[PDB]
Design a protein around this ligand. Structure first.
Ligand SMILES: NC(=O)c1ccc[n+]([C@@H]2O[C@H](COP(=O)([O-])OP(=O)(O)OC[C@H]3O[C@@H](n4cnc5c(N)ncnc54)[C@H](O)[C@@H]3O)[C@@H](O)[C@H]2O)c1
Ligand SMILES: NC(=O)c1ccc[n+]([C@@H]2O[C@H](COP(=O)([O-])OP(=O)(O)OC[C@H]3O[C@@H](n4cnc5c(N)ncnc54)[C@H](O)[C@@H]3O)[C@@H](O)[C@H]2O)c1
Ligand SMILES: NC(=O)c1ccc[n+]([C@@H]2O[C@H](COP(=O)([O-])OP(=O)(O)OC[C@H]3O[C@@H](n4cnc5c(N)ncnc54)[C@H](O)[C@@H]3O)[C@@H](O)[C@H]2O)c1
Ligand SMILES: NC(=O)c1ccc[n+]([C@@H]2O[C@H](COP(=O)([O-])OP(=O)(O)OC[C@H]3O[C@@H](n4cnc5c(N)ncnc54)[C@H](O)[C@@H]3O)[C@@H](O)[C@H]2O)c1
Ligand SMILES: *c1nc2c(ncn2[C@@H]2O[C@H](COP(=O)(O)O)[C@@H](O)[C@H]2O)c(=O)[nH]1
Ligand SMILES: *c1nc2c(ncn2[C@@H]2O[C@H](COP(=O)(O)O)[C@@H](O)[C@H]2O)c(=O)[nH]1
Ligand SMILES: *c1nc2c(ncn2[C@@H]2O[C@H](COP(=O)(O)O)[C@@H](O)[C@H]2O)c(=O)[nH]1
Ligand SMILES: *c1nc2c(ncn2[C@@H]2O[C@H](COP(=O)(O)O)[C@@H](O)[C@H]2O)c(=O)[nH]1
Ligand SMILES: *c1nc2c(ncn2[C@@H]2O[C@H](COP(=O)(O)O)[C@@H](O)[C@H]2O)c(=O)[nH]1
Ligand SMILES: [K+]
Ligand SMILES: [K+]
Ligand SMILES: [K+]
Ligand SMILES: [K+]
Lengths: 363, 363, 363, 363, 50
């Protein structure tokens, strides 16, 4: 009579959530060489990137230098909103005023750049100043996009400057929230609540949703209207990028994987003869200066951004070759297999003493 | 033909139990700002607390100082019964005889306090002495409330001093035990058998049930009759408190989270330059002086109790904002998602060298 | 179309096996005091023990001293068969020739004792010599009792000396093997293939079954005919003994839990100031002097056997009080709840630095 | 309404994949002595090995010495293709031109040997040169055999040199891929995509399938046509070999298990007084000289090959005795039990300080 | 400097040069760090004893 997990309501525990480590991509019939695969994808309904990667809007990840490097690499960067409005507009102008076949450019031939804003009248003034500076895409960047205020802000921005710039809606984790964002007029939906490597929301508040299931649910609401999905947070390997794209996301937003590059803001730190640099959540105590939802830490230095992007894109191309996907649209139709805890350790290198770190696999 | 787990009886392995680490709260459409969320909840059918947290009845957790501080913070404290009867009555008198808007006070304006009693005639004398000293709530505090003697004691206490004080029934882990306590006349039901951080009941005896499933099962029996549920044991984060309340519990009883504060009894101990203090189970060999069901240990010093309570309440408010719950009664209607082991390590911070501890998240 | 785990045969992966760590005992309505519980149980169809515990027939576990101590404590010991026939008969006579209210005795007032034999004509000579020496129960002690030769040996022993002594069949792991042993005429069935703490069978050969499922399957075949079941191996806590009895077994056989006592054969060893003593499988290379199926190691010294037995019986009595079982026969009807990996770490003590080892819970 | 793992497509997450650590073999009625079990099995449709073990085609595993030793031990070796064509043909000639009752030989009495080729016209020239030298079997050795080019190469090789040599098809993980290889004319199918100990494909690309499920799926397509299956990668114990053969595979290909033997190519390395030797994947950066799909490492020294082969065969014989299988074909009809994470640690030695390593179990 | 100040005219170097790229022998990886072999000429391996 009772539900097998307790109680009498079968909907109290709605579903079993899967994350990146729970699934593997199944190989399929292939006619695709990894070098010949096309990795272009839609960032928004009007913007297409050669490489479907976007830099996170964090004060230890993206400033003008990172945005320029990401745009030249074939992606795009999103400037963080921790600095004043005038400084953010200056960074936008620095990017717009700025070897690279894949570089993403607008109609005037200048590099594309995105900028993050919050909610409120101060956020409205920031958004208007950024728009007048020549921004290409505004990110309503919150922790909970299903709030009434976030939806109202997206609606207002679409009404005011929808012709000039694209508007992306903040993080959701359910089908209903994505549907609400689509109804509000968002040109793209960002997915993920709590999976970030520096996030403590799922511990502090106990609220979250595993990223693969969240992407599936959000795509189920966004695809019929042609609204692209950006998987944000929790990606540690190029295989995770491939899994995120196969689940239905159109682009991926990278955090820790880029915080260690030379183009990220911040100096270099030496610890026991090894190089690191600072990486902190935007809900951390230091960043928000309270109940923090992030931590402070450091990540190992990786070097130039181009090399990291090349490794990630090579992994994605290998995945596309394995699944037989000529385009990202075809990759979005691939199938998964669910694995157990033993399958995960089988997947990684095992019963071996690794003698040297590979370029795409770190200890 | 047979049961997939073995045998021919399908009810031999009745159900699959979930605990806090197995679930996450799902975000929902929200109009709630965390600072405006109302955290008040029923402790019993007659007592409403501003902060839904109660201190455990342990000789290393709650005495007069801890009870006074908890009452001032908006919760309540339960005085342990390891000391003689006269001293317990004296501690009740000290608390009653004793800046703090949230402070919980009875009709006379004195701070609320609770006291734990056992089962037997000596426990009856203790209960009468505590009632004569002005206690507001008695906890029949046993490891197994489904025993006939515990139900008899609850019925006797309700018959004798029902009009004067509230009677809370000891720990259960099933629907049937909760129903039996409700029929016996309990004003509140305490849930949890073996989840405590210092318990060895589930190892020494092999008896228990996971906390989320136990709360769901007990709520299924208590909610139709209006009897509140207290989730006792196994809580290490504010997110766990939010999960427990969302599972149908009305209040949470805290152990180790408060044992390291300055208001808990005991002297401060230095180990390798760090500060700790003692924390032991009431079924430990030291506390019960045999077949013990608890251990002795120590927990790090955490400072004043008010800051800890504020961090816990901030996490709870964040959860209420995420789920769109203006009240605790609305939070009790939120939905869960079940996660795997990989989802558990995705929820916590990962692939990062934390450089300093967060106020609400400890290494 | 295909089976969810692969292939087209739904019987290829027959069932999901549970071990001790996968389940917990559900509390039930109780009128039982742990001190008043009755722990007597059948070892065979003719022999009843006051304490349902038996010592393993291993050369680092049971000889004359251990057998005498176990018999005085209320259980029984099984003499190992590594020594020559004459020495085993001498040990049997030493036990029979040998403060202890629970002592298990025959009709003549002498202590009960069991002896292990193998398969073959040499085993027949050993068995006849042991029967002539006054042994009470013979254990056909093999790794695979479903072999034709083991069943033939059991039938021969029952035909020849069935009236004088009881015959116990070696280790099975499935319902069919237990049914075959019952058909052969065994007075008791020993259950467990690979769960021993010193066994490598499930790694070397990949063959075994989780112990709880194996016990349930064996009981489903043995209980209708009134044939007792002995859970052998894998027991590390008293709660595991309670689980094994609740799953339907009538007795439990202990290995490592008794190897560290003073009555076990072997001297005392010092490593880094701590005391240990040797413990090896009978299929280990050292013992069988090849393809070994066991390892050699050492276990910490625990002191006299009586204290260990008292702790185990106290744990069992606590579990009986929790389940409301007046007798072992009633404990055999208790219900389980299945728990996940998170529930298992909730069940043990957590988030605490233990200051001293408990008498029934070790670091 | 939705799929419990997310979305609306029930085939998005096709199945649950099992690996070796997820299953155990069930004991069955037996009349088999391990010393009398027959381990002969089909490698291809025309080649029968006395020991169903083949050495991996890796530059740290198999050269002339290893191939000769494997042929003498009753199996076969596959010469790697990292060296130039002339050198590989010279190795083949060395092996052919070369006490041992189980040695596998052709009609002329010379030792059997196999060689690996890639895809393309250069691989075509290599294959013709190897066939001219007298190789017994060609392995189309790729990471993705469901590619169109691999199938075309298999078809061409069968059309050209079909009557002289047998052609084995590269690694698959799905029923459809095995069916395509069968249609193309393969004489045996090699199964496994990413389970190898030195593979990072499941991390770099996120693509693979757990090995037991993959073997079951491939056997479902290969058994009706009498095409043998070779399980390749992820084997660490002899029990894994038994499980793989029971899943339906006819032979097993071994990597790391043989990389530490005297006959493998490479010198011996000393680290902290212990002996190791190099072991690297063929997709490693060092071996392929780029986006690598393997790592470099080293494995402990194990001694002569014959002892290792004997221990593995002894474990297999023990498994065949447990399951009552006189032949490998009977072992292919055995049954599994699925186990959890707790069952996995029950299977291994536990709660013991292993003092000396066993010949078949290493710490 | 100390050796020269004590009166010696030149210094002969061993381990200080054994780790350079111009020294004979291949490179070895251990725990992510690079090393290379260095043995005395009276070592058992070199002289192939006491
Ligand atoms: N078993 C594995 O999972 C695995 C993975 C990587 C490498 N390897 C080993 O590395 C060696 C070289 O393998 P290789 O195949 O990379 O060599 P390769 O570069 O010679 O590839 C041979 C053919 O395999 C196919 N192929 C390989 N990877 C593909 C992909 N991602 N997408 C589409 N087609 C693909 C292509 O048709 C290619 O022409 C072999 O010894 C192989 O066993 C094995
Ligand atoms: N993705 C995540 O899970 C996550 C979590 C924490 C912080 N962050 C990052 O930190 C920065 C600040 O985030 P922020 O949203 O707290 O900034 P903020 O304080 O500017 O909040 C913006 C709006 O988000 C909504 N909101 C946020 N948390 C809410 C909650 N718990 N309940 C109800 N409404 C809530 C409110 O409408 C609020 O006005 C951003 O850059 C964001 O990406 C992200
Ligand atoms: N919540 C838990 O899981 C847990 C477990 C062990 C101990 N404790 C704490 O230890 C203290 C003492 O508890 P206690 O109950 O052991 O004290 P106690 O010895 O005073 O027992 C009180 C009554 O509880 C019942 N009872 C307790 N354990 C039982 C069992 N195993 N079987 C049957 N009836 C049983 C009996 O009726 C007994 O008279 C309390 O403060 C309690 O909270 C709690
Ligand atoms: N319970 C276990 O899982 C386990 C495992 C290994 C060893 N042991 C212990 O080791 C000792 C010797 O055990 P043993 O059985 O190896 O002794 P043994 O060599 O005397 O075998 C006795 C009989 O068991 C049967 N048998 C055992 N292993 C078999 C196999 N792999 N295939 C087919 N039949 C098999 C045969 O009929 C054999 O004649 C005993 O004390 C036993 O309890 C126990
Ligand atoms: C939680 N999440 C946070 C916080 N600041 C940013 N974020 C989110 O995490 C993403 C990065 O995750 P990685 O796994 O490191 O890639 C960001 O893009 C953002 O969405 C925070 O304080 N808490
Ligand atoms: C088991 N449980 C015990 C014992 N004494 C008290 N308790 C229970 O644990 C709760 C505390 O749990 P924490 O996880 O520490 O917060 C107490 O409130 C009580 O219910 C004991 O000896 N064994
Ligand atoms: C596997 N099992 C073995 C071996 N010798 C004995 N045994 C079995 O183990 C039991 C003891 O296990 P504990 O977990 O220590 O209680 C014995 O009673 C016997 O059945 C061996 O070599 N391999
Ligand atoms: C992944 N797999 C690779 C690579 N080179 C070879 N292999 C495969 O691994 C098998 C050996 O696995 P073990 O677990 O070590 O036995 C080989 O037979 C081959 O199929 C590589 O770079 N990545
Ligand atoms: C002792 N001395 C040895 C050996 N082989 C060479 N040598 C001497 O050591 C010098 C190098 O010393 P470093 O401190 O390493 O610079 C050489 O120049 C030679 O004189 C030997 O086996 N034992
Ligand atoms: K791997
Ligand atoms: K996280
Ligand atoms: K516990
Ligand atoms: K074992």
């Amino acid at each position: 009579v009772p539900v097998p997990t307790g109680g009498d309501d079968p909907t109290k525990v709605a579903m079993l959530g899967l994350t990146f480590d729970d699934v593997l991509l199944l190989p399929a019939a292939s006619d695709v060489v990894p070098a010949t695969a096309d990795t272009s994808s839609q960032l928004t309904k009007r913007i297409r990137l050669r490489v479907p990667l976007v830099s996170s809007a964090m004060d230890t990840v993206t400033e003008s230098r990172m945005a320029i490097a990401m745009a030249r690499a074939g992606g795009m960067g999103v400037l963080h909103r921790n600095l004043p409005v005038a400084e953010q507009a200056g960074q936008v102008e620095t990017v717009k005023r700025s070897q690279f076949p894949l570089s993403t450019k607008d109609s005037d031939g200048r590099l594309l750049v995105g900028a993050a804003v919050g909610v409120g009248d101060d956020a409205w003034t920031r958004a208007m100043t950024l728009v007048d500076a020549g921004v290409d895409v505004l990110i309503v960047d919150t922790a909970h996009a299903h709030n009434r205020g976030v939806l109202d802000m997206v609606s207002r921005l679409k009404q005011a400057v929808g012709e000039r710039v694209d508007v992306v809606g903040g993080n959701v984790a359910t089908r209903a929230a994505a549907a609400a964002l689509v109804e509000a007029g968002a040109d793209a939906v960002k997915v993920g609540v709590g999976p970030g490597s520096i996030c403590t929301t799922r511990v502090v508040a106990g609220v979250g949703a595993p990223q693969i299931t969240a992407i599936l649910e959000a795509v189920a609401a966004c695809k019929p209207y042609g609204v692209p999905v950006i998987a944000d947070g929790g990606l540690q390997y190029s295989g995770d990028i491939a899994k995120a794209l196969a689940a239905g996301a159109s682009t991926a937003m990278l955090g820790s994987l880029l915080a260690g590059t030379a183009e990220s803001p911040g100096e270099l730190i030496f610890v026991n003869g090894k190089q690191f640099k600072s990486y902190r959540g935007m809900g951390s105590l230091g960043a928000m200066q309270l109940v923090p939802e992030g931590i402070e830490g450091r990540v190992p230095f990786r070097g130039p951004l181009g090399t990291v992007i090349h490794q990630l894109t090579g992994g994605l191309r290998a995945a596309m070759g394995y699944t037989g996907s000529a385009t990202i649209e075809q990759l979005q139709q691939a199938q998964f297999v669910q694995i157990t805890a033993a399958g995960l350790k089988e997947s990684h290198p095992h019963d071996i003493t690794m003698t040297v770190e590979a370029p795409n696999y770190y200890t």
